Amino acid sequence: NFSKQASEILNEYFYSHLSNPYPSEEAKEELARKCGITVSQVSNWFGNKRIRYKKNIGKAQEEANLYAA
Amino acid sequence: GRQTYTRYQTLELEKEFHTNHYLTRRRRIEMAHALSLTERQIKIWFQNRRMKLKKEIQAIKELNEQE
DNA sequence: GTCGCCATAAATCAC
DNA sequence: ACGTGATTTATGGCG
């Protein structure tokens, strides 16, 4: 499990890029340095997030409200 | 949907990968018949395994620079 | 026409 | 049991 601040950064990025939740290699490199994690860890998070977030719409909507920045 | 490979199939593929990272058309035919996997499955398995190797070496390279 | 690399989806593992 | 991060099968684009 990642730090509360690393998960915070990742969700803020995801919910503000919902129309195209595919960060470029440079955006993944910048996210990793910010979170203190690896590019492959950022890659796995986005992959898991894109498929899972849409399984519970009500929960996705609550996170969009919460992670709104 | 995706079929998970048996402990025996994985082991045998892993043993051939160590000997050879790339397969010939002939060797791919041999393993397809022996393991009961299509030539397509054997092809994709080796491709994914090569990607796994590139990943693992990078992880170790990251740690070797961190020191 | 074939095969390898790449990023990604989807299922499943491991704790 | 189920959530999370990681890993294992499988696809399509393109050189």
Side-chain angles (χ1 to χ4, degrees):
Chain A
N1 275 60
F2 306 126
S3 73
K4 192 182 135 195
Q5 27 282 314
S7 275
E8 186 61 52
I9 287 159
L10 293 160
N11 284 301
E12 275 190 39
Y13 181 101
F14 184 87
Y15 293 108
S16 68
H17 295 76
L18 226 54
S19 51
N20 187 44
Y22 299 88
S24 69
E25 188 44 52
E26 26 282 285
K28 289 182 175 173
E29 287 172 0
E30 178 186 306
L31 279 166
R33 290 184 297 248
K34 253 185 173 273
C35 295
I37 63 174
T38 61
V39 181
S40 47
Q41 275 167 315
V42 162
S43 264
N44 288 347
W45 193 93
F46 276 88
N48 282 329
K49 192 76 189 199
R50 285 191 300 264
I51 196 154
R52 286 161 180 178
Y53 101 102
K54 55 197 204 193
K55 292 176 173 178
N56 192 330
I57 300 289
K59 182 183 184 121
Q61 287 174 312
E62 186 47 63
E63 303 200 329
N65 172 62
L66 195 91
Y67 295 121
Chain B
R2 72 169 281 252
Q3 76 167 100
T4 50
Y5 296 173
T6 61
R7 179 219 92 261
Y8 177 78
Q9 280 164 326
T10 300
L11 203 92
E12 290 301 284
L13 287 169
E14 218 56 105
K15 205 187 169 183
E16 197 60 41
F17 183 79
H18 177 70
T19 307
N20 291 295
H21 292 172
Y22 293 89
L23 280 191
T24 64
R25 185 72 157 81
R26 197 45 55 194
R27 201 75 179 92
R28 207 175 74 213
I29 293 157
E30 285 188 337
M31 291 192 90
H33 288 159
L35 303 177
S36 339
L37 293 171
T38 65
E39 285 182 49
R40 177 151 289 278
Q41 287 172 297
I42 307 288
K43 212 215 218 167
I44 297 152
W45 193 93
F46 270 76
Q47 251 167 222
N48 289 332
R49 192 58 191 93
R50 268 175 239 128
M51 225 62 60
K52 181 170 175 189
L53 184 60
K54 248 153 176 165
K55 252 174 252 187
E56 280 176 338
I57 287 169
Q58 183 60 30
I60 301 156
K61 215 166 286 169
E62 253 126 49
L63 153 138
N64 185 251
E65 292 187 4
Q66 250 147 263
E67 299 167 354

